[PDB]
Amino acid sequence: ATVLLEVPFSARGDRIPDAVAELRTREPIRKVRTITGAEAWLVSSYALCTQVLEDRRFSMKETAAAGAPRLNALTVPPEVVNNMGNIADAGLRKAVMKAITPKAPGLEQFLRDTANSLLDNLITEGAPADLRNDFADPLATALHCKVLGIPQEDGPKLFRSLSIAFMSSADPIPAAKINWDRDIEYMAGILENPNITTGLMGELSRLRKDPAYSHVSDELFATIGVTFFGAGVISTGSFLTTALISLIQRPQLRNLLHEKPELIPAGVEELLRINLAFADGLPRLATADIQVGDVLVRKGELVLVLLEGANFDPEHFPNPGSIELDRPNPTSHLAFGRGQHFCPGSALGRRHAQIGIEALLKKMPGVDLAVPIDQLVWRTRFQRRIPERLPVLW
Amino acid sequence: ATVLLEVPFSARGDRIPDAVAELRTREPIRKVRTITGAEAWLVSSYALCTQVLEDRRFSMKETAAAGAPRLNALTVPPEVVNNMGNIADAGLRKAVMKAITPKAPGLEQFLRDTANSLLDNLITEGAPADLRNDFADPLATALHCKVLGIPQEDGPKLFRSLSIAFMSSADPIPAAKINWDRDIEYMAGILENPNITTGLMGELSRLRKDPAYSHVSDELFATIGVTFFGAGVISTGSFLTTALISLIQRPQLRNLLHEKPELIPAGVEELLRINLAFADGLPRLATADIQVGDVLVRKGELVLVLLEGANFDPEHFPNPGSIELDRPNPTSHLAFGRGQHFCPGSALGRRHAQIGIEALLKKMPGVDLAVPIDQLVWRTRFQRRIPERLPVLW
Ligand code: HEM
Ligand code: HEM
To answer: What residues does the record give for site: Important for the position of heme (chains A, B)?
Structure first.
């Protein structure tokens, strides 16, 4: 008597469990138990992961349904799970997506200036430095304040919500609601603030008073701010942190990218491909009986799309664990998802990582871990895998 | 084929593994493998734990011997493992121990004022609060600056060394030496600083220039500062943090202690007894062949004294998992060790916890976790078990 295989497998973000490949080979769709006690189907091949993400009958929205089998507890109101649908329904999708590209004048220069300041401060203070708490996350937080059009000084408090907001918990989290409600009131005030005229919130603030959006709720406008700040900051800060580990562990690659920084975009795409920051499969609920591989998934069942399942699939990415800058299919990974809910911040995510890495390699060409890799403390029961601190020297 | 039982068993500090009692019953001394790959004897009964700690032929000093089986890598120079011997040999033991009692005029008032300020700040900011990073540790750090006689503003930088200095690592940790060397230079400067006239460092500074200590090394004086600050802050901050979890989880006890705070000392003694903050057994190396229970420990072998083994031993503490304020043997636990290396800060440790708890209960009588207990992130490969954050509401 063993128990049903539990997910997630490991909170360690520096290496993929040997188990994933064994599972992909033996049973690329298989039954697992989540932290709530619910059963789910874990999908781990590139082929099946793509099938599920490209079939909307595997629904994101319906994961929020009362009584559904759950990966984890909601940390937002249930309607907010369909945030992107809600945005599209309100006629705001084009405007939202336009505000969060890396293309606004001054944005990239702001990113570089900010990275360089953070780095200069670390160099002035002397090794060891914490690249997560004192570089990657602050860079993410600064970026998103700028992208939203909100004061830099407001970023830290919003950031402080995230260690709870992105928990992956069996049970509802009282602190999540306290912080959610507070952050919503914050964004509501931002929309009322005549001095906020730039970024996403500046644009939302104008659309809010345009007749074509008079019946769009103030709740939805505030929700867009909280949701995009949170997803953006947690996703970019965590990706960059774990990408830095991948790089640091590859001195040859570090030197190549330092010597030839025009390769940094190709480097970042591979670092995205091999990234283990998403802690759990992407959840979807079946709205029909659907054949996936050898399993007939039944209506009402939960499906988890394991991104590293797809991204380390040797059928699609030969020598999957190696960073190779000359692959013929380099953006075909699932780091940003696929299909209806493909990441709307993908360009911005790329640029944050590319600029952060460029700046780091320039300032700290000798960057290395200052502790044995095993000494990193991996955050548990969270929607990302991240080291609590990332101590480096240079 | 299983492997040899590995230690430590769990980094979770909120509950003792069912395994410990099974082990204590079946094999209260048994072979284990440490994180270095070394074999060791894990001792887990009150009787055998006391036997080992009271027999100096199980040596602390000799754990630092080149080529010995190791629990973990040294994070200090090897001579520093015998710090207390070194202090006693230099004629400084009485003076050191006198400076770190809770008895200096103003000290306890300082502790209370500090706790109350920290708490007021949390209340002003609003729930949720992090009781580790924003109460217990800062209280510990403030206390030890005061005890040492050094500026409060110097505490945070010294504190920042500790997440690495008290790692429990398989391998040497480069950052540990960087920080050690820096902190030693700091304490050396303190001894040269004419404005430092109080506390432990004020007293050491005077003894340093007294003829009776002219041939005591400046290295040893600086080492006393780094070592006592580190052990003190990590031990009190971590104990208080985990004691707060124990209390919060016991609303009846929380209310009793709030209503009748004269019971807080008895409460703190039980919280000490059941505390799981020490992450690993206390290491000793056998300097002779010695019978321990059914095992003849051989010269050169490593022995690990599992404090919760002793402290949850139902033979000595009936109903060991229950906090009972009327036990007939309440201080007979091993939270502060036993024998030659009994904690020299035990009184101070008690008072820090008693004052912190009194202040918390007064200010936050409604204190409760703001997240499900399972959502706490337990620090790994560290010499203490502690949650990275302790989110509360009240
Ligand atoms: C390297 C950085 C990033 C990575 C790796 C990443 C990854 C992802 C992934 C895998 C999804 C799909 C989730 C699903 O299908 O269940 C997603 C969606 C999303 N992302 Fe990103 N993301 C990043 C950056 C950003 C940024 C910068 C923002 C906003 C400023 C953002 C906002 C969002 C939002 C709002 C969704 C939900 C899309 C939907 O539900 O339709 N992300 N992201
Ligand atoms: C609740 C607070 C504390 C707890 C639970 C605690 C626990 C312990 C334990 C179990 C030992 C024995 C280690 C061994 O035998 O291997 C010890 C030793 C020691 N403690 Fe504490 N301690 C606390 C507070 C303090 C404070 C406040 C200081 C100093 C200001 C301190 C300084 C030391 C030192 C220097 C040793 C080494 C003793 C030796 O090697 O002879 N501790 N502590």
So the answer is: 344
Q: Interhelix angle for A346-363 vs A107-125, to 10°?
A: 40
Q: Which amino acid is at B24?
A: R
Would you call B128 helix, strand, or coil by DSSP? coil
Q: What is d(CA A3, CA B23) in angstroms, rounded to the nearest whole number? A: 24
For residue A279, which of A34, A4, A21 has the smallest C-alpha distance? A34
How large is the angle between the packed helices A218-248 and A199-207, nearest 10 degrees? 160
Range of the domain at B26: 1-394
Beta bridge partners of B130: B391
B332 CB neighbour count, 10 Å cutoff: 16
Residues 6+ apart with CB under 8 A from B120: B363
Q: Which residues of A touch B (CB under 8 A)?
A: 126-128, 163-164, 167, 169-171, 173-175, 178-179, 182, 370-372, 374-375, 377-382, 388-389, 391, 393
Helix (H) or strand (E) holding B303: strand B302-305
Residue type, B73: A
SS3 content of chain A, % helix, strand, coil (to 5): 50, 10, 40
Pairing state between β A39-43 and A302-305: parallel
CB contact under 8 A, A174 and B393: yes
**B27 contacts: CB under 8 Å, gap ≥ 6:** none
By residue count, chain B amounts to: 394
- Interfacial residues of B (vs A; Cβ cutoff 8 Å): 126-128, 163-164, 167, 169-171, 173-175, 178-179, 182, 370-372, 374-375, 377-382, 388-389, 391, 393
- Assign residue A3 a region: left if phi > 0, alpha if psi is -120 to 50, beta otherwise? beta
Task: For residue B233, give both structure tokens.
Answer: 């802050």
β-pairing verdict for A295-297 and A290-292: antiparallel
Q: Write the DSSP symbol of residue A382.
A: B
Q: A228 CB under 6 A from ligand 1?
A: yes
CATH number at residue A22: 1.10.630.10
B278: phi then psi, degrees, rounded to nearest 5: -70, 120
Question: Which residues are CB-contacts of A59 (< 8 A; sequence separation ≥ 6)?
Answer: A284, A285, A286, A287
From first CA to last CA, the distance across chain A in angstroms is 50
Nearest to B370 by CA among A79, A190, A2, A173: A173
Q: Name the residue type at position B181.
A: D
Chain B residues with CB under 8 Å of A374 CB are 169-171, 381
Q: Which residue of chain A has the CA closest to B370? A: A175
Tokens of B259: 């209503």
Q: Which residues of B touch A180 (CB under 8 A)?
A: none
- Count of Cβ atoms closer than 10 Å to residue A295 Cβ: 18
> Any alpha helices (H) in chain A, and if so which ranges?
18-26, 46-53, 83-89, 93-99, 107-125, 137-148, 155-160, 162-165, 174-192, 199-207, 218-248, 251-259, 264-273, 307-311, 346-363
Distance in angstroms (rounded) separating the CA atoms of residues A205 and A224: 11
CB B51 within 8 A of CB B309: no
Tell me how many domains chain B contains: 1
What is the DSSP pairing of strand B391-393 with strand B129-130?
Answer: antiparallel
Concatenated DSSP letters for B142-168?
Answer: HHHHHHHT--GGGHHHHHHTHHHHTB-
Torsion, CA B322, CA B324, CA B328, CA B333, rounded to 10: 50
Cα separation values, B369 from B42, B130, B255, B393, Å? 34, 10, 15, 6
Q: How far is CA B139 from CA B142, B175, B347, B349, in A?
A: 5, 25, 16, 12
